[model samples]
Target: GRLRVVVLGSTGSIGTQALQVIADNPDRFEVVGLAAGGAHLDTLLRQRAQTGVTNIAVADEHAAQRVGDIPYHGSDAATRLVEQTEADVVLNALVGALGLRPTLAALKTGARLALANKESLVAGGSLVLRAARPGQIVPVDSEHSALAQCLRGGTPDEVAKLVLTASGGPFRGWSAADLEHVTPEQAGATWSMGPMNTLNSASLVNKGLEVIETHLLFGIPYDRIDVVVHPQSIIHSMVTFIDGSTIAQASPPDMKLPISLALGWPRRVSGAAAACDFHTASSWEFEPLDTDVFPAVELARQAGVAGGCMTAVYNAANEEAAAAFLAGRIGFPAIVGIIADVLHAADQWAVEPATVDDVLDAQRWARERAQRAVSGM
Candidate 1:
């Protein structure tokens, strides 16, 4: 019996790697449905040819029009693709808040979701938690994957705490003075050299979302879940038990390894993932975080503790600010500043999202206000 898997954002960094993983384990997995935002049509078609997935979804009208007569799920197809597909598992690789709906669809339908998109967990942590049935959500983010691996041996109550590791990003030791007017070129070299789309990574805002994600998934209180600067990116995450035992999951920083883990969960499959040669690096260093410089992490932690729709506001603002930074509309340091400002400026709405509309509304308000912050900036 082949394991049917659906890959949303199939043309993305995580999706491409997932397809490669499936190719490696032909006997175990099958690509059932593939979807992506419009710009990556070539990659989508290539996947179509390889896996025979004709039920395709795209994020824009122009892109949907390009695939004449194929089974099309139009703009904002992420939710529909996850709901309508005949997949055993859904791997949602969508970036930012865009991935939230599809994750909701998968979970409400009782499909096991391999979530690479952190925004869903970041923006709607409480909502996802309430909707979660047994084994409904699985995280593909490296830190959460590490937590999952560490928790494999014990009961949730026996766990003392979960520790997440960060690369300290580009501006590890730099203060506010060092981050002003930072060029995209310079941002690329030190942190996430690819597209710099996630300026939040430089400020560890993404790591903050991971903190919320950890809290939501494991039911850990915000106080026990902690962050530390680990520049090596080797130890993905750690879990300490009540009895003084600790387990850490370490791997060379790679999204594919986590994707593969999700693809083969409940059973590990063989693969060619890059492994850690423990002897090569003689030292693994850890440092206390300086939240004064990158204040967004503190903001996210506060929002996570606040519960309800506050996390949505935090994520929405960060997304808007990050897009501006990546597009050269603002400086790197301002990404954190904008998130802090948005949280401060927005009127606190006591929301417990009862429907998808509730979640989207919280998202909409945050997005609008974040843009307003940018305009005034």
Candidate 2:
């Protein structure tokens, strides 16, 4: 029987690629449900038409009106879709903290979660883990997916460290003064997922978020996970073993590879992405992430190590600071500073979250402080 899969946020890049992964392998999978943020109703409609999936969800209620007679859901669409459609697998490509609810819902139903929405883990870190059964959550991110595949080579105890590779952003080799000249529109630089492409890449904040993600997805501690700057992006990530061998998942930079791998976990879908070629001469390089240079990575590690809801604060403050910088209210470097200040001021540091509400509450609390810090700066 085909795996009944639901694609949430189906209109976005991750959503579309996820859809393609299903489409590429018809007998292996079926598109039972499709959901999008609703602003892209046209794309959603197109996807629904193509997949013939009647279970549809839109985050915008007003937009759901046009989806009449299609067995539509609005606002709480992702969760409802998971509950109602009864999928065997769910891909939550939703953005930000909003994906937390859907992630929880999908897991509760015993449906395996294909989680591309990282904030769900960053915000709901332990909570998400607690809800998930063993092997229930399949990470949809390239690095994590790579790590997942690599883990097959060794048992948990036999594994040494999870090495995450970064593209190093746009200003990888830039000096301090070179970074100071960056502007707001300049901070918009990426592989193209969300906002602050330029700044986050340059500051390495994106990598930091990935660090927290690595921790939550695998039960690895902060010290066991390491990040290396790999500008080529050929190596998604690596798992080193105590046996003195390293297993890495290397492929051409293609989202489909990870997406398809996530859908077909423990088994692989062929031709999802082109295989790396030895015929072509290419150079892959790696370097240690110096905290002195891109402190964003270190800062995220600090918050993650602090445990509890502190990771939520780090995520929230970075967003506010990035928004401020993009709005021309703050400089690029100040983004890290604001995040630090907000994280330190969070007197509720390292407090375990009893519920997802606690995570969002921490996010809200930290978000306000960053705005205050932004104005102060």
Candidate 3:
């Protein structure tokens, strides 16, 4: 029998690519369910019709109206779909905190998860990690995927550190003055992403979040997980063993590879993505992260190390700041500043999120706190 698969956030970049991976391997995989945040109903409907998927969910209520008699609707639709639908694996490509409930839902059913939403782990690390059964979650992020692969080369006790590689964004070498008047257009122009993604990449905030995620997934100390700037992005990530040998996963920067890997875990499949050519004269240069300029990395590390709901506060504040910066209400540098402010305030209220509701409450409090900071700024 083909593997039963469910895809969340079916219209977004990661979700869309995940569907492509499924299409590429029809005989081995079947998309039993699909869900999206309601940004592109036409695409979702077309995909559902094309793939013969019946179970669907949408976050936006107005857009849900056009979904016809789809089984799930409203904000909680993703979690509902996950709970009610039967799938061998759930590819949760949904972005932000919205992915948390579905993550827990799938984990509770003993279903494997292909997780692209790092915010789920960032905001609900304790809750999400606790819910997951052993080897239940596979990462769709290139960095985490690479790290997971590299870890296979050695035993867990032999591992020394996890090193994540970054592309250093568009403003890699820019000075503070150079970044002051930078527009969202400038940040996004260099990458194939929306304003939020571009901003996160530019300031290395996404890398910071990934650090927290790596810790959550691998149970590695925050101090042991590190990041480096790899301009070429050929080396996805690296893992060092205690004996001093380092193993790295190098491939052409592609999301489909990880998506396919997540789906075909414990089994290797033919290429669903571009192959890296070692024959080419490629210049893969690695540099130390410039913390003097990009401060989000440190801020994220603090949040992750602080444990409990502080990561949620950090994530929520960052999200709020990124949106404000994208709206031209705040500067690029101010994004980290806003997060730092929220972190300071939440440090007093930070407590472990033992339940899903606790995580939600932490998220709500952080969002409100972040909004107040944003308004003041």
Better of 1 and 2 by TM-score: 2
Once fitted onto the true fold, the runs of candidate 1 whose alpha carbons sit more than 4 angstroms away are 76-78, 189-193, 196-198, 279-281, 323-331, 375-377
lDDT to native, each model: 0.80, 0.85, 0.86
TM-score result, candidate 1: 0.91
**Which prediction has the highest lDDT against the true structure?**
3
lDDT of 2 by residue, 7-43 (tens): 8889888989888778889988888888888788998
User: In candidate 3, how many Å is residue 315 off?
Assistant: 1.1
Best by TM-score: 2
Model 2 regions more than 4 Å off: 189-194
TM-score for each prediction? 0.91, 0.96, 0.94
Residues 1-377, candidate 3, lDDT per residue (tens digit)? Answer: 58999998899898888888888898888988999988789888898789888788888889989757878999899989989988899999888778888888989988899898877898878888778987999998999989989999999999999999999999997888898888888888223357578778988999999999999999999889888999999899999999999999988888888889998886755877788886868788998888888888889999888899888888888888888888888888888898998888887546778777777787788778878887973
lDDT of 2: 0.85
